[PDB]
Structure 1
């Protein structure tokens, strides 16, 4: 059962008459649903994402400066000017330098000086923000029936089904193989509010970093870095990463404040990560409430005869699942298919069956069955699968 793979697992149980079940599925969680006369089902919210979300601003973390130009005039010659002062994509500073005979001016005094640099951004040194549209966000829910077959996490359960939900398409009917149909009504509106969320992306090809972060819109909009719209050619406020030195005669130095990535990363510690897979921008945390309709589900193998009580052996002896249940797997050497005669008694009371089965109507099919998950009361018990027995101390 898929839910046995994780630590975060909930059990939902429907009694007599319970045909519908309302669950709050959370990313990283898993729910096992059990109900009288119904095959058990594992359900979980698998992903929350939007493909190609809209991009808000792009910020530059490392300025690439080039073509530094300086123009200086002697004290009586008027303002110094450069064509660059009027071009976008350049950062300039006008100042005054001390001039005199030493640097070829007729008078000793203040002379106009102006320096400009072309400012661009280093390749792969942008920080881009993305915003979600509640109407385009997709919630993916997976359902897996309890078939008495154990499948590891790196393996694929042939009976697992997937359902996708958007605000405009909240209901799906899934056919669970021979178990019947299950209906899922999940409301995206009951999900995570995304108004103040921005998915921040740096360079997703960097190997030792998460591919994205989920940050607050107000924090993102206040970053003190050069910015522009995707598609725009030049950067606004490029001066944020450039400093000019005090001028001396006909020269003025231009300083680059360096790569701000390290600075940003310190700010991002403790911020939740997100994930990008191609064009899909995923949230790594979130939840949604769904209504599961069980009325069309039917159990499998109710009319088989009981398996020969003499032909069972333990493939995997009873073991603690970590969810206060016991898991085990048996092998049957008799004729299939048949119902597995499972029960358990408390040490000293051989007459009362104390086993509460999670796995519905355990059966050995022609090519499956054998895995059983059950709950037992605290203390010493003995598990029986026909004549096959096993001691079990619960707790």
Structure 2
């Protein structure tokens, strides 16, 4: 459950090396895992809270000037000056006006004059950082079997919500009737904060790269504002325009709200209002099997009368989720279920719920199978074979190997490195695979960072060419280098 119909998705058929499942989950993802035993699970993490952060900086965006005065001194003898410049709480500028003889000055030619204004900020925004210690992720995993709760009941109670903070390590998940799934989250290498800068803003926020955050112009504060206003800058905003010669005064240069927004156009949205719970994250971890047994395996494979309640959908090649409704032969028991091939028995349909089990002689359960490519039959129920539902999919073998090639490739070129953490267990392949993409990734493909996607692909091309019409062997490597990797990141990227 919690995943049936969620687009982003993925399965993992395999327990390997005794409970060693390797998974990565990112909010709108829910990873589901099957095994040659154990009621497969649907994993989805949600609320990823942060607590007790600190205000590191405080750019303001609605500056306002007041008290503004201006002194002048006359040709040569005196780069003009006055009291006001004393209170750094102001702003000033030494400039040259043509103070001439008639002006009522000295011996005309040209002279000095400064302008000054007390600078009050009106609505800053404030950054914020969070020590990874205090990055409480919430993980909600769950069984199947179905019920009135059904699919994506979301707002209810199933699998519970085992919350985990790296301020601990491995967490037990008491799963009703089944046992205790054990997870080893690595919340310390996921999002990668204290590299990240939480940033509120007039009531809305953005997780944003530390650097950039310590560069965007504007008049800034420190961390310990508390009645300060000694804004390092102000020069970013407020400007004193000096037309042609004389006069020369100051001006606000307006707010910056929307401007700010438009500038911030790469960071993900988030929160701040309600104990800032920054979604979008993506942590990995070892899902540790064992001590995770399926429910039935005891009571008979009961036979009887049963209708159905709904046809069948399928988002994601194979999601045959069928509603049934047993009756007659009572007492909570199993269910005879097969995904056979048109009449002539030779069954071949992947089961995902690993046997249901009725429980209330009412409880319209629902199974979840992955029928073959062509046409398939879901024969559910023995004795007079009470029911056989003919269906047909489109599991077109090859269409499969491809959409996977990509969708997978995607999960790769989004997460990077940890992409390999999706393949439970190493052994040269996935193990060394990471080991290499790890650095070859963090390098080239990831050492020419910060360039807008457009430019990115542009380099893809210029390079595919500097490659393509190459000169002896080396080209192939050059091409690939271009193709995919970059050329692709680009045709993809831009989250």
TM range (shorter): 0.7 to 0.9
Partner of 2:221: 228
In 2, Cα distance between the equivalents of 1:344 and 1:106? 103
1:1-395 alignment to 2 at 5 Å?
Answer: 1-14=1-14, 18-73=18-73, 80-99=80-99, 102-105=102-105, 108=108, 110=110, 112-123=112-123, 126-149=124-147, 151-153=150-152, 155-204=154-203, 211-232=204-225, 233-234=228-229, 235-246=231-242, 251-293=247-289, 295-309=290-304, 311-334=305-328, 335-349=330-344, 351-366=345-360, 368=363, 370-386=365-381, 387-395=386-394
In 2, Cα distance between the equivalents of 1:256 and 1:171? 55
Cα deviation, 1:146-198, whole Å, max 9, x if unaligned, reads 13335344643422222233333111112111211221111223423334322
Structure 2: gaps of 5 or more residues:
395-495
- Greater share of strand: 1
Compared CA separation, residues 64 and 17, structure 1 to 2 (3 A)? closer
Structure 1: gaps of 5 or more residues:
205-210
Determine helix, strand or coil for the equivalent of 1:174.
strand
Q: CA deviation at 1:100?
A: 5.2
Compared CA separation, residues 342 and 120, structure 1 to 2 (3 A)? same
In 1, Cα distance between the equivalents of 2:16 and 2:244? 90
Determine helix, strand or coil for the equivalent of 2:131.
coil
Cα deviation, 1:269-319, whole Å, max 9, x if unaligned, reads 2343333342225151322223323x222322333344443x211101133
* Counterpart contact for 1:2–1:151, Cα < 8 Å: no
Q: Which protein is bigger by CA-based radius of gyration?
A: 1
Query: With structure 1 as the length reference, what TM-score do the two structures score?
Result: 0.86
* Counterpart contact for 2:61–2:125, Cα < 8 Å: yes
In 1, Cα distance between the equivalents of 2:58 and 2:104? 46
* Counterpart contact for 1:72–1:250, Cα < 8 Å: no
Compared CA separation, residues 237 and 19, structure 1 to 2 (3 A)? closer
- Greater share of helix: 2
Compared CA separation, residues 360 and 152, structure 1 to 2 (3 A)? closer
Number of aligned positions between the proteins: 384
Compared CA separation, residues 301 and 291, structure 1 to 2 (3 A)? closer
* Counterpart contact for 1:148–1:363, Cα < 8 Å: no
In 1, Cα distance between the equivalents of 2:63 and 2:16? 68
In 2, Cα distance between the equivalents of 1:19 and 1:80? 79
Q: CA deviation at 1:201?
A: 2.4
* Counterpart contact for 1:94–1:114, Cα < 8 Å: yes
What is the aligned-residue RMSD (CA, Å)?
2.8
In 2, Cα distance between the equivalents of 1:324 and 1:101? 91
Q: CA deviation at 1:131?
A: 2.4
Whose relative contact order is higher, 1 or 2, with alpha carbons under 8 Å and at least 6 apart? 1
In 2, Cα distance between the equivalents of 1:115 and 1:317? 78
Q: CA deviation at 1:228?
A: 0.8
* Counterpart contact for 2:377–2:388, Cα < 8 Å: yes
Query: With structure 2 as the length reference, what TM-score do the two structures score?
Result: 0.70
Cα deviation, 1:37-82, whole Å, max 9, x if unaligned, reads 3222211232444223222111122311112222345669966543
* Counterpart contact for 1:59–1:128, Cα < 8 Å: yes
Determine helix, strand or coil for the equivalent of 1:316.
coil
In 1, Cα distance between the equivalents of 2:224 and 2:341? 72
